[PDB]
Design a protein around this ligand. Structure first.
Ligand SMILES: Nc1nc2c(ncn2[C@@H]2O[C@H](COP(=O)(O)OP(=O)(O)OP(=O)(O)O)[C@@H](O)[C@H]2O)c(=O)[nH]1
Ligand SMILES: Nc1ncnc2c1ncn2[C@@H]1O[C@H](COP(=O)(O)OP(=O)(O)OP(=O)(O)O)[C@@H](O)[C@H]1O
Ligand SMILES: [Mg+2]
Ligand SMILES: [Mg+2]
Ligand SMILES: [Mg+2]
Ligand SMILES: [Mg+2]
Ligand SMILES: [Mg+2]
Lengths: 930, 937
DNA sequence: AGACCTTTT
RNA sequence: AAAG
């Protein structure tokens, strides 16, 4: 249809090119809108392209590309490894990535843009078959609603699925067949392709001598389909995620070092419930290898990983006394019947490790359930608001005090935000014209050279702008800070030492709150929950008990394997395969909470349909033998693509839940439990085969939830109280009755304070030192006077340019600033013996010359009060030099001229700031080195 | 006796001109007169009214024909003037040093040198009676070569009288002596201002006349302590002088005075809680708040009234009420706890984050003695030395390959925050930082590579040599799984005998393994010094959740016959720290020994037990009798304190003999260990041990009058016959010395010139000017020759100290200036007159550059020490590239507040080593959730 | 063959 | 300069 002819043609003159140039050569043709199946250019393969280490070399002279724009270039390390590294480098895989619907012409549905070559973390499938044989795209689903579409035909969804799954796709000399799809402004889904055949493929192992292999065979290698025909084919397709999961290959274990359990840990109450879903033990030696190959400073107590068909958490055996390598699996972890024979089905693959915990706070989503469970809902609301007002008042107060002393404000500006990542990537603080491009680095840059925010109004104004903006972000983003809270990986107690409703929490280091610190939790009640929390029982109050038996297990929370039901299931139906629990030991949050029982979930079979058709049932429609199994696999893919590309009712029903519970001000009434139970059965929609369409979502809303098809937005979604009377919902109350008035009071104070000759000014006699010293010379000279007059006028012309291009009002703002800065640097002695001393030519950077100091000093005096931004935008660099030189005092130490790189590697000494202000306040001798 | 004639006019004379003067100037006007040798009584005189309201010493001192020292810090001076000698706990100290005068004419025997006004942490007595009323001196001991003949003939008793029988007059004040302790060997003596011209029979210059006999009665309440031996009583005055941070004044109803210590459950009567009591969690929180601590301290070392010792948080305190308890073992005298200064918690130290310790020479003999396989123990300790050396050198050699990595390493090798805070800048000697670490980072921050510039290479070479030479001498073999930790008793009876509880306030790191507590392992506990074979004990670490709150402390059981602390060289829980080791390679071969059968040395150890009471029956009863007895106690105890200490001689003897015998467990070793154990407590326990007693003990039990030779390891090289067999000889000469020489050759081999075409670019710039200008050539020429004269002055093996010598040469270096050389437009551009710091002008750069060219190889230490600051400026100017960022000129103060960011180094080097797409280390790449995976599947 | 050690305010 |  329109879809046909969408893919780029491979010109038959690159048929010998390595696929690395072939991918990058096919990109330049696209971006430069040039056909490649034409003799118009007379193009032919330059053998110089093989052995290349830069894509730029390949791109470099002909008519059709002369002057056209260049596309983003793949980085050299990826290209080198692409050409000479067999697409793998240090556990990373070179990725063939691509990504849209704009011309409504009846005869190409999509505009395809190939994305550059790039490194990403490999997976089992790329480590077994080669990264070059995998290709991913981002394509918009036919089952979305926002209109960008021609959709406007009934069977388009089937047609789109037919294009991707029915047959092979030709690109870069390789035949790509689709094997997986999952959801990643329009909703776009990620589709994965495998290179089944190619030009350089042997019809029977380096990148260019790949034996032809079919997707049906690749998937049969991963899932061992013969022994898993009993599985529903939609769940079988979902297990392909385990093969695509970006994991760190750790080690390969031998069959005799693997303990396949046939039974899970079941409830001691005979209820049959599994108390260890997704969790197994590993040896202390295996954990040590995880540390060694990943570069960690400590043996991880627990890891999230995969191992053959097994998926979940693995935790150190506290009772491991030897140093023999081993690992165990359970049925709850094993997602398909696997023989664990190939070394890739026996490699421990780590997704992440349980690392040090940082404070989580209390996100607003939990407050309705915490309010539903408060023994006194009026005190809890009062306490949460008092906590918020105090935190806000503390934040605003701590800012104003730091402004009084420049060493203290430097801490604050450093603590407030973070530029390390930018400093590492640029090897320096990046500068826009004459100042750092960020406002935080500009404040610290200028204060490092002696400028005071309480004295220099340019600094006062910038510090004013950031606090205005922090205030404006605090009333769109509401944050209830709870120091004694963290998200922690959930682990089960294999050793039966934890009683029902007892939990073990030990930290790997000091967990700091303002007034207390912890290395473990003991003899206190804690609140555990999984986010999001829906049912009133989705948050549970339990007893933290520190068991010395488990002391070695750190940065995990351990739940009891006693009792009727595992605690992880009561937390929104969770388990121990990577789930994290919100853990709160803040007494003010815990002591009000009363536990609710698990609700009676309603029967929603009338609305929720499950397709449980097995691989066997899908295969018997084709017969028996290899070719039948091979066809059923391709069917499994196609039938699963319709389901994956279906609408996201999990998101729609969750947004309805938020609104329903808001307008009703209830999370425990019958509508809320029905909705919570519904979104619970929709988390696994693709996996457990839940077919749920708009019409089923229509009945349920009208029949069972209150009749409303569409519910209003909650008021807290707006940034101003558009409600009637005092807020009633707890979140509305916290945003508009507590936070908003408090933020406003500081903003009012800000303008009122902004409104005396006693204050911060633009003028600084230090900054005009060079202007005056020359005037003394110029007034007694003729030559100096001419240079001075020419320079002063020259600065004026650039100031005029700044006003038109940057101040008053196309080309982007940084580019305009740079254009004026180019003219600013252009002011020079050459354009008008003294000239040599000012120029200092032996210096490569003209900006480091004395001329630049005089140019800055002269521009300052002439424009410090009419055009302040112009002087600092162009010459703050030299203004800071002048300030540091002028403020130096003989015998009072020595200023230091840091290089750009060495500067970016320094940070404020927190212990210096505290200790220095202490000495100034007369507390000269207090307790040392803490 | 005359000494007595030379003990007349010792203290400076107080004229009538300064009678009105405040103690602050009267002290410091006296100081200058003495330094410049101008008599206070010179008629060749009016008080300056300006001096009374002065806030700076230079104003005092500038106010004259005769005048052509160290100045009291300007803040301390204001406190002495207007803050009543007391600024936020710190006290202004009146100090002085006395030496024997070379003049042998029987003129003053001692030469006084009043030390400048300074700040020190106050104490109970200064806070109660005023810091102005206390004077402290260092005086030579009269019981000591170099001793003057007048003292050598006849003298000790004549000096002691001069100190104790009368008041001495200084700065308008009459000072009586009240305490003395051992600081030629010198003794520290403390005085109390009993009267003065300004005194009357509160303000500093309006002080009621108070006597030493009463000052001591307030502190010790002597009426209720006549039963104590008067020497022990005198030693308790040190509790009133302990430099302490006053935390809070507790009320009487909050103080629980226990009357019976915790005793052994076996009926032996042994005390299991000596020096240790409990405190409320609230009291601990105020300690945190008053001292500015980040966390709540579990345990503290302090004093409360008559109580001295450790106070630990009560783990059962669920309330918010402030309370403290005292025990008999803590209370050093009968106290009523009525005055608020006798009810104030005073803290000397708080239990804090522990650091890894090192093995010491004292512990190794005992460790070998108790080893079941000595060969294994030796191999392990040596192997620990060889691998510890190998890491140190490998960590540094790698670090030298990148300036950002070596700056990180230098910053981590030494912490200079205190000197930075103290000065508000990095202290500079001439044109480079004082410290070597700070010199390296200063030059690296301006663009110098420590592997390309030889001057930096030589500094790091010299610095690593000094540490290696220290490891040769000390053998402080670092052991990661070890630390010194305050000892505490288990009030709650959950620990069994030989079970200890150790929990850390944070992660304690040892290479591969890290710990927040100790559990299920054996540990070694020992107190330094270790002498007896029983002075180290193998015990079991058991973590008890009931004691989880107590951190950075080691808890011992209160069950069992004898407290484990007592088995550690007779230690207790009043401040004692234990060497704690959980290294399996060190712990698992140790076999405990029973406490030693100490021999009777009463024959030579004479214990004066005279009580205050018997000392007073020579006077009768009543206040006048008490006052006399208290002044008797001072004089008699000064006699005992000023007496020679033989612990150094007897410990040095035990070392030399036990080395000869290679045994710390035979009869002479038990004898000498028992002897040194009594000598440490001599002043408190009143044991007289004369030279004759040491002579008699040596001749009857220990080898006689023979002077024992020094052990081999006291020498740098093995001059011994054969192969080293003593474990210290073995480790220093067979292990350390060869391994250090091998790691050193590798270090140098890995490591580069003094020349730098950038550092000589200003020289070249004016070389091209001086050719087309005879005037510029004259300046240029004059400047060159001026530089050489300074270099000659710098250079040879000098009574003046090294910094003073360098500063002198530096001042003639800065003297070079554009003095007349005729084109003024140029002289001004070089001069940069507007700048106040002349070392910031363009001339100082050229002076540095020109010096560099004429002397990069010749005398290299000259140009760097003088002009290294300007050499750094030229480097950072030259190495700047257009558009590649901006160099930064940072003030001295702001520079001292920055530090290297470990996370920047690790991220930058990882990004640069190609391998930056691997696992995100949480400590390098930090709702609080970090890395949870690379994708979604 | 010649007068202690340890780690911190 | 302390403390053990
Ligand atoms: N080697 C050595 N050890 C010392 C020295 N001074 C004190 N010690 C040690 O400190 C111990 C004294 O402990 P303290 O806490 O001061 O006092 P105490 O023995 O408990 O006695 P009380 O003050 O009555 O509780 C003994 C020694 O082990 C010294 O100069 N050298
Ligand atoms: N008979 C069955 N009927 C329905 N679902 C089943 C059946 N047997 C197993 N399952 C499903 O198999 C899935 C395998 O668990 P899996 O680890 O994939 O889920 P999860 O713990 O929710 O995942 P994650 O926390 O890693 O996002 C479960 O969701 C479970 O419901
Ligand atoms: Mg699971
Ligand atoms: Mg899960
Ligand atoms: Mg004691
Ligand atoms: Mg005692
Ligand atoms: Mg003690």
């Amino acid at each position: 249809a329109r879809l046909r002819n969408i893919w780029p043609k491979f010109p038959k003159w690159l048929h010998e090119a390595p696929l690395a140039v072939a991918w990058e050569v096919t990109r330049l043709f696209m971006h430069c809108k040039v056909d490649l199946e034409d003799e118009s250019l007379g193009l032919k393969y330059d053998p110089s392209w093989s052995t290349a280490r830069d894509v730029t070399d390949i791109w470099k002279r002909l008519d059709a590309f002369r002057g056209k724009p260049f596309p983003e270039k793949p980085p050299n390390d990826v290209f080198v490894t692409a050409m000479t590294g067999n697409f793998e480098s240090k556990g990373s895989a070179v990725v063939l990535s691509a990504v849209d619907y704009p011309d409504n012409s009846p005869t190409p549905l999509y505009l395809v843009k190939l994305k550059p070559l790039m490194f990403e973390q490999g997976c089992r499938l790329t480590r077994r078959f080669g990264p070059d044989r995998f290709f991913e795209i981002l394509i918009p689903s036919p089952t979305s609603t926002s209109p960008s579409p021609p959709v406007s035909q009934p069977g388009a969804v089937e047609e789109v699925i037919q294009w991707l799954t029915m047959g092979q796709h030709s690109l870069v000399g390789r035949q790509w067949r689709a094997f997986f799809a999952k959801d990643a402004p329009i909703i776009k889904e990620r589709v994965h392709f495998f290179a089944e055949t190619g030009i350089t493929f042997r019809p029977d192992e380096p990148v260019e001598q790949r034996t032809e292999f079919k997707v049906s065979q690749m998937l049969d290698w991963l899932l061992q389909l013969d022994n898993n025909t009993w599985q529903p084919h939609l769940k079988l397709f979902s297990r392909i995620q385990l093969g695509l999961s970006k994991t760190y290959a750790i080690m390969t274990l031998e069959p005799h070092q693997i303990r396949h359990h046939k039974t899970d840990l079941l409830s001691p109450s005979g209820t049959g419930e599994v108390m260890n879903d997704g969790v197994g033990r590993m040896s202390r030696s295996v954990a040590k290898r995880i540390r060694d190959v990943l570069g960690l400073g400590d043996v991880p107590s627990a890891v999230q990983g995969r191992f053959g068909s097994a998926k979940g958490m693995w935790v150190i055996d506290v009772d491991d006394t030897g140093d023999e390598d081993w690992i165990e699996t359970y049925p709850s972890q094993r997602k398909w019947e696997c023989d664990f024979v190939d070394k890739h089905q026996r490699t421990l693959e780590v997704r992440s490790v349980a690392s040090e915990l940082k404070s989580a706070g209390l996100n607003l989503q939990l407050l309705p359930v915490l309010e539903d469970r408060a023994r006194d809902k009026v005190k809890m609301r009062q306490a949460i608001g008092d906590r918020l007002i105090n935190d806000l008042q503390r934040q605003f107060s701590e800012q104003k005090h730091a402004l009084n002393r420049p060493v203290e404000f430097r801490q604050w500006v450093y603590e407030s935000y973070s530029s390390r990542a930018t400093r590492v990537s640029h090897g320096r603080v990046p500068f826009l014209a004459g100042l750092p491009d960020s406002q935080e680095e500009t404040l610290n840059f200028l204060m490092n050279s002696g400028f005071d925010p309480k004295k220099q109004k340019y600094l006062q104004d910038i510090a004013w702008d950031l606090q205005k903006r922090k205030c404006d972000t605090l009333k769109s983003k509401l944050n209830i800070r709870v120091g004694r809270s963290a998200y922690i990986y959930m682990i089960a107690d294999f050793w039966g030492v934890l009683e029902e409703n007892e939990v073990h929490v030990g930290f790997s280091s000091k967990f700091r709150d303002e007034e207390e610190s912890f290395t473990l939790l003991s003899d206190c009640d804690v609140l555990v929950a999984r986010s999001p929390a829906h049912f009133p029982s989705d948050i549970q109050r339990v007893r933290a008990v520190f068991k010395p038996e488990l002391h070695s297990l750190k940065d995990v929370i351990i739940f009891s394997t006693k009792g009727d039901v595992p605690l992880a299931k009561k937390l929104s139906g969770g388990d121990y395969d990577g789930d994290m629990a919100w853990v709160c030991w803040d007494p003010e949050i815990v002591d009000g909470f009363v536990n609710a029982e698990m609700p009676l979930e309603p029967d929603l079979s009338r609305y929720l349909k499950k397709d449980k058709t097995t691989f066997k049932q899908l295969m018997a429609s084709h017969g028996t033998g290899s070719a039948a199994k091979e066809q059923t696999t391709y069917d499994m893919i196609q039938k699963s693509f319709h389901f994956a590309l279906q609408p996201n009712f999990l998101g729609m029903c969750t947004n309805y839940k938020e609104r329903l519970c808001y307008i009703n001000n209830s999370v425990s009434n019958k509508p809320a439990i029905i909705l919570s139970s519904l979104v619970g059965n929709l988390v696994d929609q693709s996996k457990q085969g839940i077919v749920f369409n708009e019409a089923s979502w229509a009945q349920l809303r009208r029949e069972l939830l209150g009749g409303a098809l569409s519910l209003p937005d909650p008021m807290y979604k707006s940034d101003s109280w558009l409600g009637r009377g005092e807020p009633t919902h707890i979140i509305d109350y916290l945003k508009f009755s507590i936070a908003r008035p408090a933020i406003d009071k500081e903003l009012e104070a800000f303008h009122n304070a902004m409104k005396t000759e006693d204050g911060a000014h633009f003028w600084d006699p230090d900054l005009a030192s060079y202007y005056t010293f020359f005037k003394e010379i110029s007034d007694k000279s003729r030559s100096s006077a001419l240079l001075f007059t020419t320079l002063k006028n020259r600065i004026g012309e650039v100031e005029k340019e700044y006003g038109r291009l940057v101040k008053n009002k196309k080309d982007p703002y940084p580019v305009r600033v740079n254009q004026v800065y180019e003219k600013w640097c252009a002011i020079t002695p050459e354009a008008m013996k003294v000239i040599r001393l000012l120029e200092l030519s032996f210096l490569a950077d003209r900006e480091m010359n004395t001329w630049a100091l005089l140019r800055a000093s002269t521009a300052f005096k002439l424009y410090y009060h009419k055009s302040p931004k112009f002087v600092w935008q162009m010459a703050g660099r030299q203004l800071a030099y002048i300030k540091a030189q002028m403020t130096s005092r003989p015998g009072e130490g020595a200023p230091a001229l840091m290089t750009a790189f060495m500067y970016a590697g320094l940070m404020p000494d927190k212990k210096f700031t505290k200790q220095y202000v202490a000495r100034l306040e007369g507390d000269g001798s207090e307790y040392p080195d803490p």
